[PDB]
Structure formats: C-alpha cells, structure tokens
Amino acid sequence: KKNHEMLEGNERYEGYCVDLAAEIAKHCGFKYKLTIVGDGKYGARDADTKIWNGMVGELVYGKADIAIAPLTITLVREEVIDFSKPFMSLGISIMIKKPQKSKPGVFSFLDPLAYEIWMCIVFAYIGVSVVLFLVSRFSPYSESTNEFGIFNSLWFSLGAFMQQGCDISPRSLSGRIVGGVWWFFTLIIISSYTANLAAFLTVERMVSPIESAEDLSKQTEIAYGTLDSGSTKEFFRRSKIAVFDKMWTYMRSAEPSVFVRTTAEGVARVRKSKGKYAYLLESTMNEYIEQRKPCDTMKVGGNLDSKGYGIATPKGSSLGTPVNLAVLKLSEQGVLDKLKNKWWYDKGECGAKDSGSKEKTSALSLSNVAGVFYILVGGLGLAMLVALIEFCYKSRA
Amino acid sequence: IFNSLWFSLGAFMQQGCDISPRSLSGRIVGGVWWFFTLIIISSYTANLAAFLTVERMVSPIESAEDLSKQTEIAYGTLDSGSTKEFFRRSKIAVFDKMWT
Amino acid sequence: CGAKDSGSKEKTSALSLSNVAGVFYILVGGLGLAMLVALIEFCYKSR
Amino acid sequence: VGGNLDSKGYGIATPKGSSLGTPVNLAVLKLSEQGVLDKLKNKWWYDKGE
Amino acid sequence: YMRSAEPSVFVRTTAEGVARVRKSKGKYAYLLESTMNEYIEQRKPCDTMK
Ligand SMILES: CC1=NN=C(c2ccc(N)cc2)c2cc3c(cc2C1)OCO3
Ligand SMILES: N[C@@H](CCC(=O)O)C(=O)O
C-alpha cells in the first residue's frame, strides 16, 4: 500500500489477489493473514533433492494453510498440493522492446548523402563558379561579348546542379569544358542521391519484426530468457515441441545467464537492453506492464499455451474443498471477471498508438520532407527581405 | 503574375521555362524552389521504386478487438454452438461488445 | 554465431565520399584543363 | 488472424453416471503422459503441411 | 517429403529421372550419385548443373 510503511496488518497490501482473498474469506467465513513469501520464488522441485521451494515449499512443509496468489496449475504441482478451479486463465507470451522511435529528423532529406558529400558539393559549386567566371572574363586580345559575370556564373552553375537549366550557356571552348564537366558531376550526384534514397526506402521494409515465438528459435541476434524457478522454465524444460525445444536448448546453452530472480528484474532488463533482449512471460504480466508507464512495450504474437491460475492448499487440507467451491461460485457470480477489469482495464491510461500495424501507411508523411518546406519558406522570406532592402537603398540613394 | 505561375509550374517539373529571374531576390526564390522541387521529385520516384518492390501489405483484423469497433466486416459463429454460448455468457467488456 | 538465412537487415547507410570520390577528381581535373586551355588561347592571341 | 479469444480444450464426454467415464479419463491421462496425443496431433496437422 | 509427396517422385531408371528433370522446367530435382552426375553434366544437351 502507498502507506505500507505506516499501515499494519493486511492493510499494507492491495491488488487482485488481496481482493480475491477478502472475497474468499467473506464467502467461506474464516479469518486470514496475508504473508509475503520468504523465498521470493514461485516454486519448483529442486534437482537431486526434490525439495519444493517457494509457494509449493511453504504449502507442503506446513508453513502456510492457503496460497491465494498467481499460481499456475501444473501437473507436477497437483501431486503435492491441491488447486482450486481456474479463477483466471492465460498463456505464455512474448515481451520485446518497441522497434524504435524512428521519427525522421527535420532535415532528414540530407540523409541519403553523407555530410562530407554536401560539404564538398558546396565547395565544388564555389570552385566551378569562380573558374567559369575566370575563364570567360579575361581579355580576348570588346571584352564583354558574353553574359558570364560572377553573379551570372553562380546562377548558371546553381541551375546546372538542380538540372533546371538557365538562360545562358558558355560559348567559348574552355567555358564549355567547365560546363561539361560540371554537368557530368551533377548527373552523377543526382543519380546517386535518388538511388541511395530508393535503397533506404526499400530496405526499410524488410525489417520484419519478430513474432510467433518461431523467430526467436530461428535466429540468435535477439536474446530471450525466462523467469527462474517459475512455471515457464519448467514448461520449456518439459515441452518436446520443436520450437519450444530449440528455445530451451538455446537458453540452456546461452551465456551469460538469461534467467532473472524476479519478474521486475526481467522487465527492467528488457526495457534497458536496446530491444536486443526479449522476456518470455505470462500473458497477463505482459498486458499489465504494457498498459503501465513508461509504456515502452507491446505484446507480440499469440499465447504460447493455455494455463490457468488456481488457489493452492496443502494436500489433504480441510480448506481445499470450501475454497474451491467459493472460487467456482465467484466464477458464476462474475466477481473474478469484475476484479480482472478493476485491476487490468481500470488501471489503463492508454494510448494504443505507434503499433506500426494498419496505421503504418507508405504514402510518405509530411514529417519526412518537412525540412524542405521550412527551407522553402525561409528562402521566400529572405528573398522578400532582400528585395525590400534593395528597394530602400535604391530609392533613398 | 501569370508568367510567374507558369515559371513556378515549369520548375516543379524538370521542364526548363523560357524565362529566368535575372534579379537577386528573384534568383533566391528561383534557387530555393529549385531545391524544393528536386528533393520532392527524387523522394517521389525513390518511394515509388521502393513500393513496386516488396509486398505483404494491408490486414483487415489483427488484434481480434477491431471487429468490436469496425462494422464493414461482419463476423459470426456456428449456430447452437459452444462459441455462441461462450459469447452469450462472457462478461469481458470487449467480448460483451462483440456479442451484443 | 550465424547469419540468419539471407536477411542481413540494416539501414542502407549514406553514401560516403569514397563512393563518389572519382567524380570530384574528374571535376577538378576538368577545371584545371579548362584554365590551361583558356590561358593557352589567351597567350596565342596575345602574340 | 489474432490470438486466442478464450482458453478451453477438447474432452471425451459420457452421459452422467456412466461407468465408462473413469476408464476413459484414465486412458486420456495415460495418453497425455505417454505423448501419444502429440504424435497423433503431428500425424493429423503437421505431416500434411504442404 | 518424398514419402508424403504425390504423385510418385521416384523413377525406375536414371535416364527417366534425367529426362523428367530436363522436361520439367526446373520444377523437379533428381537425387543421384556424384560421379554419375558428373557424367550427365558433361554430355549434351549439357543443361544439367549440380
Ligand atoms: C528517417 C529517414 N527517413 N527519410 C530518408 C528521407 C530522405 C529524403 C526524403 N525526401 C525523404 C526521406 C532517409 C534516407 C536514407 C537514410 C536515412 C533517412 C532518414 O540513410 C540512407 O538513406
Ligand atoms: N507464476 C508462475 C511463474 C512463472 C510464470 O509466469 O509462468 C509460477 O507459479 O511458477
């Protein structure tokens, strides 16, 4: 609870399981004491010792009378503890960081050519302009037999680069050599720009985000892990399905260890790791974290399986049947679904954008070329300002 | 005015017009508009060459929740079937929407 | 290790100055040739 | 398209009070633990995958 | 695949398989020994590459 440091007793806790425990206590009529598990693990039978840890250990060894907690009903646990009928159902899901905040920069139109090419294009433009002035304008031995002053030279070379032509063309031999070599340069550079832009806009489609849990087994660029001592680790261990077996083999041979002690550590790892690491988790944990800030996450692909949550009791305990009956009654009454909405859907503040799904529409957006419009309007304003200052100077003098 | 409309139309395509600004601020407008049209035309042809390659576009339903919001695609189950009964009793908000 | 199958997905990356370096050499050589030709014609017509 | 809307399976059914219920429940459990269910699922879904 | 594919992909004689591959626009492949493959590859019409 927000005031758990000051509250005492069961008032310190809140959530789906706390409300479910309250409803179960009300229906059956017993008093209950909510206790945090000392081990921290969900539960599994340790190798070569058969000692159950976590929840199953607490239940079997007489430490606890009931476990109203997100426990997945599994066959290997039914042999030592008794579960109630599934009060909620889910499946194994896949967690991965969002593709990218790949928003195009304002000046993203300069991207197809490196900064050095633009710098050297400006330098080559200045050099060609100055040379085309020098070549066409020193004495023929009147001398002004052509219109290629320095300003007209700059205009001609700028027009030649943009492939828009110009009102003049060099008439001497050496002026024509300059024109020809500049024409070849601008042809090569414009073709290269178009070709490279097409290359980017094409290979930006083969991105093909991973899904279906089969891409994880197919490649190893994106690492994935599983909660330690959880039922998902056992699910991957026991399963003989080819894709699940392959992911099991990789995660067993992968180093450093991909396991996380607690689910929160896994969430932090997958959030921080540049989208390189994936987390294998249950669907409800995926869909709740998906709906909570910073909301840097989605849920990808369908559920890997179908396993339900149940309230577990020590084997042979008198609490098993009444609690199971209460769970079934609440399922009939819809209190379980109501609490599901209350704690999953009623805590949402989404959102639901940037899915890059249907939304994604080729039709290149304005944001990709928005810099060109800024340059255009800036140039228009500058031209009006230049005309005004020229008019003022030429009228006042 | 009409000659300038023709020029700025001629400059957007790559067809050289029969006049040129010949002043300083006129040449500034001409130059910046030439750069704009160069970038836009190159983007159009590069994007088209991107699309004519590669396929696997469009999808009507992806999240199984869009059917509750969309109406152009009708959806139904087997009559007197278990799916019909499940929709008939489900209290999930989105499932209740589709059932209604 | 392993390449995935043939994917090798990545950004295209921008053309470096090495890719179009030759056209700049062509251009500057053209400017040098043009200045040489202009001066040759000027000196020929100065005699 | 999309994921599973619900989560429930397919089960062998008998009329209420039929003596056949317990043996067939034992049989389906034995098949599940023997992996025969997976073999039949492969034989009827994945072998004809062309 | 060869056990599940229909119609039968197997051939009675090697020459039948070679003719099948040549006539089948490249949609059919033949499985054969390397040395005998080297001989068919080196004789006309010589459109057969390993
Ligand atoms: C976010 C990206 N999106 N825009 C273009 C781009 C460039 C020009 C125009 N008109 C439209 C779009 C791009 C092209 C690239 C590139 C990076 C980018 C940035 O690296 C290799 O070529
Ligand atoms: N709640 C699971 C932990 C792993 C999982 O999310 O499946 C368990 O009871 O072991």
Numbering used by the authors:
A (entry chain C): 409 to 549, 565 to 820
B (entry chain B): 573 to 672
C (entry chain D): 773 to 819
D (entry chain B): 723 to 772
E (entry chain A): 673 to 722
Can you quote the paper on this entry?
Excitatory neurotransmission is principally mediated by α-amino-3-hydroxy-5-methyl-4-isoxazolepropionic acid (AMPA)-subtype ionotropic glutamate receptors (AMPARs). GYKI-52466 binds in the ion channel collar and inhibits AMPARs by decoupling the ligand-binding domains from the ion channel.
In the second scheme (GluA2-γ2IS-2), the receptors were preincubated with GYKI-52466 in addition to CTZ and Glu was added immediately before freezing. Each approach resulted in similar inhibited states, with each domain in the structures only varying by a root-mean-square deviation (r.m.s.d.) of 0.3–0.4 Å. A structural comparison of GluA2-γ2IS-1, GluA2-γ2IS-2 and PPLMs bound to resting-state AMPARs reveals that we captured a distinct, allosterically inhibited AMPAR conformation. The substantial rupturing of the D1 interfaces in both GluA2-γ2IS-1 and GluA2-γ2IS-2 places these LBD dimers squarely into the desensitized classification of LBD dimers. The distance change of 6 Å agrees with our GluA2-γ2IS-1 and GluA2-γ2IS-2 cryo-EM structures, which show a D1–D1 (Leu467) distance change of 6 Å when compared to the CTZ-bound, activated-state AMPAR structure.
